[PDB]
Amino acid sequence: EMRILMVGLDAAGKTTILYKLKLGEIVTTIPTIGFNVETVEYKNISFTVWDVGGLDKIRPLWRHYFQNTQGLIFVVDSNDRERVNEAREELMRMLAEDELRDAVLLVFANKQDLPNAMNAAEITDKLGLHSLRHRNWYIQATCATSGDGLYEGLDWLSNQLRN
Amino acid sequence: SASAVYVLDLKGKVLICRNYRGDVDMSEVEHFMPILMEKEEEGMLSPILAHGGVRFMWIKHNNLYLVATSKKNACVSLVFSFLYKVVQVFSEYFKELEEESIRDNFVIIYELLDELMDFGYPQTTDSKILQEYITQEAPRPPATVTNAVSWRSEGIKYRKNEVFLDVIEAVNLLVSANGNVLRSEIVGSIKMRVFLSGMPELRLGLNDKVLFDNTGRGKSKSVELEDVKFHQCVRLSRFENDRTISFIPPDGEFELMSYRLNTHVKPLIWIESVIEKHSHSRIEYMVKAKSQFKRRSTANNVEIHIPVPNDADSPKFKTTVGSVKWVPENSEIVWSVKSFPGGKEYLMRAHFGLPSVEAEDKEGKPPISVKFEIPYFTTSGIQVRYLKIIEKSGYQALPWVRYITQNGDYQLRTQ
Amino acid sequence: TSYDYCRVPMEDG
Amino acid sequence: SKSSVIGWPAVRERMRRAEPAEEVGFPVTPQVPLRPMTYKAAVDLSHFLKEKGGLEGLIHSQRRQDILDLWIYHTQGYFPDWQNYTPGPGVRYPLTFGWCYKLVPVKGENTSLLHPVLEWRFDSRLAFHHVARELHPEYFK
Ligand SMILES: Nc1nc2c(ncn2[C@@H]2O[C@H](COP(=O)(O)OP(=O)(O)OP(=O)(O)O)[C@@H](O)[C@H]2O)c(=O)[nH]1
Ligand SMILES: [Mg+2]
């Protein structure tokens, strides 16, 4: 059992990830206004995953799911150099809360498809993940439309449940 | 000055009705409760209502509304003191006073209404002497009813002669959020339990400051009574002269005197509490309880009531000594400690959660009230010196006393 | 009344 | 006056370490009967102070009195208002009927570097001839 949240910007593939983790296929997904949950069942831990869409009118309501959260997924796009700043703003906005203080971080460099897509390292330092405090943050470069690195992030995450 | 004293319920139907002048109509009572619905829901609640020219003096019992109605410029404290007396006399008769006490015992209660008051004028309200000719089980009225001594019948006889006193302290406290004591007075009250033969005149003396000042012992231990309110039976003209507590007691349990005084010394137990109210998240109460009072003394069964938020949830308590019960029904915690001696200082660390959604409205800040009780311990330092038993027959009674210190209003204003 | 009593003097002359 | 022997040098030391020139409230010893310092017990005490010694001609003060009086209350059960004396003008006669001692007027490193009061007298007729009553007639009726 683990409460999982999939936060991030819009068009992040986060529902593309979620139905790849639960089902295994890339379903044609609308821009999800509300949220999503599928209990992904993997590595002796049932990951209860609260995927929530990342459009503008939703981001204030993000605080309502930050309770009993054992772990984050802050999905980033590797193909959004223009939005990495507000994502870095979002991250520094969101992590700084007393609620959601003991949940580790697993960042997905989604949409590794282009030379526009960066690696984990540049995305780490554009976000400044070394500036974090009280964090088991761990970026994990993933390809949602091919399942690549997805189970490996879940692998790292399942290590990070027990102590 | 009453005309028609009524008893209502929580619904507003008449439990019992009794007029004394006829100057207030009996159907006026049906407007009271909607006006009571009116004044409360607009916050204009007062113990006096008015439907035109009928004035509605009422108190509120557990279920009951002892509504005394009048029309003229009646004496107000005349009414309400009688109202609590009728509650008291019913409490003297009926060990609980509810709707079952009225509708099952209308045989005696209408007779009480005939007896306690005529026309609006209370004439006989001492229940102990009232038991002798108003029974729920009739002879002539007693002479004590006629007598100026109206609290103690003659011929009362026991095998033993026991005078049981209860010098009871009640510590008021107002500590603000600043941590300063705003108002800490002590209202002590000596309540007597007399089991004596005949008609004795008891004469009491304490460690009065003024009586020691009249004696010349105003350098030793002397409590300073800022005001006392006594029983009727205390001859206050004799007390006004030379601090003389001289009286003929009634028989049984009664409060003789009610002293009140301020005290500029520390509270017996200092509380330090904190609030880590995290918005949408949680709250933490690292509360300690140090005992400032005497180490020989022990605060029995203390019950620290700390108001928690209403939607507070997932309680966690790291105590040191003493258990917590979380009372969401009062939206609070009772960190209860049975034995808590003087000098002791016990911490409790509370932890709740908080909903990630906010609530709709505010809640306000109730203070923290604890329920301490320390026996054999006068904080004001009052000491009964003697008790002169004076009987014409002449006997050696057994005067007895114990000292108990409790809280009065032990409020400590929170963050 | 679980607490116990204490006897005062009568006269205190 | 049996348990008044075990603190007869001990409390007097605290009296003598008291200069002749937390806590809140007053505890009462449970189930022990209390009474004022009676006449014959004051005769029992004035001879207890006559015989055990270390008291006569000592520098009396009020701080020593209050150390002494509360110790009588907590160890012997007597109301600590018995060691009351007449005030400033006159010989400090005891108001206590039975106290045969009248009060006539008469460590070291706590001093700084360079520096920039009564006593008893035995009177056995104070038990009968109340001389403090002669100094205070209107208070004693
Ligand atoms: N080429 C490529 N495209 C991807 C990949 N992952 C996601 N995408 C694209 O990103 C788009 C957004 O994915 P969705 O999951 O459907 O939408 P979302 O990110 O969840 O946004 P919301 O529905 O508003 O929460 C998809 O339509 C995909 O075409 C990837 O790994 N490679
Ligand atoms: Mg989506």
Side-chain angles (χ1 to χ4, degrees), chain A, chain B, chain C, chain D residues 1-21 23-141:
Chain A
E1 290 293 330
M2 194 173 177
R3 182 174 178 88
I4 301 302
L5 272 70
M6 294 188 71
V7 291
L9 303 172
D10 55 347
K14 62 178 76 173
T15 51
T16 297
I17 290 163
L18 189 271
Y19 293 102
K20 183 70 177 177
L21 294 180
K22 181 66 173 64
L23 299 174
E25 292 295 327
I26 309 301
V27 295
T28 299
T29 308
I30 53 96
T32 54
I33 302 302
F35 62 96
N36 292 110
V37 60
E38 291 296 327
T39 303
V40 177
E41 186 181 358
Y42 180 66
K43 294 294 289 182
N44 69 25
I45 299 299
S46 68
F47 295 101
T48 302
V49 180
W50 293 93
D51 185 86
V52 182
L55 276 301
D56 193 5
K57 61 178 75 175
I58 293 100
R59 302 184 180 184
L61 297 176
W62 286 0
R63 66 183 181 274
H64 298 286
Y65 289 164
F66 293 170
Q67 187 172 2
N68 299 115
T69 298
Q70 296 178 356
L72 279 80
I73 298 171
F74 185 71
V75 181
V76 306
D77 189 0
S78 303
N79 290 315
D80 290 335
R81 187 183 292 109
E82 294 84 2
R83 292 174 64 88
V84 72
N85 296 317
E86 58 182 2
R88 187 177 182 172
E89 190 274 332
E90 175 65 39
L91 190 66
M92 278 67 170
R93 184 181 71 86
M94 180 178 63
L95 293 183
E97 299 176 353
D98 180 79
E99 62 182 5
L100 190 138
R101 62 181 181 86
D102 291 331
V104 306
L105 185 59
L106 181 64
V107 178
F108 286 167
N110 194 359
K111 302 179 70 177
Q112 299 296 326
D113 54 349
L114 287 177
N116 195 4
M118 294 84 173
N119 55 0
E122 177 177 357
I123 290 173
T124 296
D125 297 328
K126 287 185 291 180
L127 293 175
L129 297 178
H130 296 283
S131 62
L132 296 177
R133 183 79 282 285
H134 293 281
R135 297 299 172 180
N136 295 323
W137 60 270
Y138 180 73
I139 189 169
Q140 179 63 257
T142 54
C143 300
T145 51
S146 64
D148 294 330
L150 291 179
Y151 295 99
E152 296 179 351
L154 294 178
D155 196 4
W156 179 75
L157 185 63
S158 59
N159 297 119
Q160 297 301 107
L161 186 63
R162 66 185 183 274
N163 294 320
Chain B
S1 297
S3 177
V5 181
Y6 297 153
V7 173
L8 294 173
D9 57 342
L10 302 177
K11 299 181 293 300
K13 69 182 176 63
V14 176
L15 296 180
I16 193 162
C17 64
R18 179 75 176 90
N19 50 0
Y20 290 95
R21 301 176 68 188
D23 298 335
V24 174
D25 297 331
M26 302 298 287
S27 297
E28 296 292 327
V29 66
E30 299 175 354
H31 299 85
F32 174 78
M33 182 59 72
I35 292 167
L36 190 145
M37 293 304 170
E38 180 182 3
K39 301 289 177 67
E40 190 271 330
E41 292 169 352
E42 68 191 0
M44 292 303 294
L45 180 62
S46 296
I48 298 166
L49 302 182
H51 186 275
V54 175
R55 295 298 187 270
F56 293 98
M57 289 63 70
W58 59 271
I59 62 171
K60 174 176 173 63
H61 196 262
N62 299 120
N63 298 317
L64 290 75
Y65 292 92
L66 282 78
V67 179
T69 61
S70 176
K71 181 173 69 178
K72 297 193 292 184
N73 191 9
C75 183
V76 178
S77 67
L78 180 67
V79 174
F80 286 90
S81 301
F82 185 71
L83 292 176
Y84 298 114
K85 182 63 66 68
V86 169
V87 172
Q88 177 182 2
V89 171
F90 287 167
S91 303
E92 294 295 324
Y93 286 163
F94 299 145
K95 277 78 178 174
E96 293 181 354
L97 183 60
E98 288 177 354
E99 299 174 354
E100 55 180 2
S101 300
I102 305 302
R103 298 174 290 112
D104 300 332
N105 296 318
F106 59 93
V107 178
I108 190 168
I109 297 164
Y110 283 105
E111 298 175 352
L112 296 166
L113 300 174
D114 183 74
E115 184 68 30
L116 294 167
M117 169 176 277
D118 293 334
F119 185 73
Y121 292 159
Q123 57 178 0
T124 300
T125 53
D126 290 332
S127 68
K128 182 66 180 294
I129 312 298
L130 184 59
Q131 292 169 356
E132 296 177 352
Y133 62 101
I134 303 299
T135 64
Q136 63 185 358
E137 183 177 1
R140 297 179 69 255
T144 304
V145 172
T146 67
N147 193 4
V149 173
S150 61
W151 55 87
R152 178 70 182 272
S153 295
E154 57 88 20
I156 292 171
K157 178 68 176 67
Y158 294 97
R159 182 63 59 86
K160 294 178 71 68
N161 285 313
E162 290 176 346
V163 187
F164 286 159
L165 284 80
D166 287 323
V167 180
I168 300 165
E169 306 291 330
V171 176
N172 293 314
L173 181 58
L174 181 56
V175 171
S176 69
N178 295 319
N180 51 356
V181 173
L182 296 177
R183 184 178 66 192
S184 182
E185 62 186 1
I186 297 169
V187 184
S189 293
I190 297 175
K191 179 173 66 66
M192 297 179 67
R193 294 181 63 245
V194 169
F195 296 96
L196 291 183
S197 295
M199 295 300 289
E201 180 183 2
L202 272 62
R203 291 195 299 273
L204 186 64
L206 305 172
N207 53 354
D208 185 8
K209 183 176 174 65
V210 181
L211 184 63
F212 285 169
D213 289 330
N214 294 120
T215 309
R217 291 178 293 174
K219 64 177 73 174
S220 63
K221 185 176 182 181
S222 69
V223 67
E224 182 177 1
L225 304 177
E226 190 174 358
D227 192 9
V228 191
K229 292 188 181 296
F230 291 93
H231 196 202
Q232 172 182 356
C233 65
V234 180
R235 300 282 74 76
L236 301 172
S237 64
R238 297 179 63 189
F239 183 80
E240 181 67 31
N241 301 316
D242 52 354
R243 309 292 287 163
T244 297
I245 309 166
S246 178
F247 63 99
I248 291 94
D251 190 72
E253 183 177 1
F254 66 98
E255 177 179 358
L256 188 67
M257 62 180 283
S258 304
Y259 63 92
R260 194 264 305 171
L261 74 158
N262 298 317
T263 297
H264 299 85
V265 198
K266 298 180 291 295
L268 300 173
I269 287 163
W270 183 259
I271 304 297
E272 194 276 334
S273 69
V274 294
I275 296 172
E276 293 183 353
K277 181 179 180 179
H278 297 286
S279 296
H280 295 288
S281 177
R282 57 181 183 167
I283 197 161
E284 285 87 354
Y285 296 159
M286 284 63 72
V287 56
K288 68 181 71 177
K290 61 187 72 61
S291 54
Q292 307 298 108
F293 66 96
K294 301 295 178 66
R295 275 75 177 174
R296 294 180 184 270
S297 299
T298 296
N300 289 319
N301 61 19
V302 307
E303 291 176 356
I304 301 176
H305 297 83
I306 300 167
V308 312
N310 194 5
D311 55 352
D313 47 356
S314 178
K316 296 178 178 66
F317 305 112
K318 183 176 72 65
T319 74
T320 54
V321 171
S323 66
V324 185
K325 58 177 180 292
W326 176 50
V327 182
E329 298 89 5
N330 296 318
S331 176
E332 66 177 357
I333 48 172
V334 191
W335 179 45
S336 296
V337 178
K338 179 60 68 179
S339 177
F340 178 64
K344 303 294 185 294
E345 175 175 0
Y346 296 159
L347 182 65
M348 194 277 290
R349 175 179 185 274
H351 183 278
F352 291 85
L354 203 154
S356 63
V357 63
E358 67 181 5
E360 295 179 354
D361 293 330
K362 296 300 292 180
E363 294 183 355
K365 293 179 290 298
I368 292 96
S369 65
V370 319
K371 303 300 179 184
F372 63 94
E373 180 178 1
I374 305 173
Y376 297 97
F377 182 70
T378 55
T379 302
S380 296
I382 188 165
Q383 292 175 355
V384 46
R385 296 183 62 86
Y386 60 93
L387 188 140
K388 288 190 283 183
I389 293 292
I390 304 301
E391 184 73 29
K392 182 178 88 274
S393 296
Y395 56 83
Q396 297 293 319
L398 293 176
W400 293 95
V401 68
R402 66 189 187 272
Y403 292 162
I404 295 164
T405 296
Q406 296 174 359
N407 47 0
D409 286 332
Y410 198 74
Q411 290 183 357
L412 284 81
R413 293 184 177 181
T414 182
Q415 299 296 109
Chain C
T1 67
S2 295
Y3 292 154
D4 292 331
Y5 286 101
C6 292
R7 182 180 183 275
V8 303
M10 181 175 172
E11 64 280 14
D12 195 3
Chain D
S1 184
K2 274 79 68 178
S3 178
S4 64
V5 182
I6 65 171
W8 184 259
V11 180
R12 188 178 66 242
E13 180 66 30
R14 187 179 65 187
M15 288 170 66
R16 288 174 184 175
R17 295 302 95 193
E19 294 289 329
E23 68 272 13
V24 48
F26 293 94
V28 175
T29 305
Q31 293 177 355
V32 171
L34 296 173
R35 61 182 182 178
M37 196 66 201
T38 64
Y39 178 74
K40 63 179 292 295
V43 173
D44 287 330
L45 190 64
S46 295
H47 291 88
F48 182 78
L49 269 63
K50 187 70 176 177
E51 289 176 353
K52 295 293 184 182
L55 190 276
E56 185 66 29
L58 186 150
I59 303 300
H60 180 275
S61 67
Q62 186 67 43
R63 183 177 176 181
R64 290 172 182 267
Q65 170 182 355
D66 297 331
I67 286 170
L68 190 145
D69 282 334
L70 274 74
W71 180 68
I72 301 302
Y73 180 72
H74 294 87
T75 60
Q76 298 297 108
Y78 291 94
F79 291 102
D81 56 350
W82 59 270
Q83 200 177 5
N84 287 323
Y85 290 89
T86 54
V91 176
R92 280 78 185 270
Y93 290 109
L95 305 179
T96 299
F97 185 77
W99 183 254
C100 295
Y101 294 100
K102 62 185 179 180
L103 294 175
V104 295
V106 303
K107 191 69 64 69
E109 294 181 352
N110 285 322
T111 65
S112 72
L113 190 147
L114 73 158
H115 298 170
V117 177
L118 288 170
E119 64 183 1
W120 288 264
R121 185 175 294 171
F122 182 74
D123 190 72
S124 66
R125 71 183 184 272
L126 284 169
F128 291 102
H129 189 194
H130 191 191
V131 189
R133 187 177 176 181
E134 291 179 348
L135 271 70
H136 296 88
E138 71 271 13
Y139 290 162
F140 290 156
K141 294 179 180 179

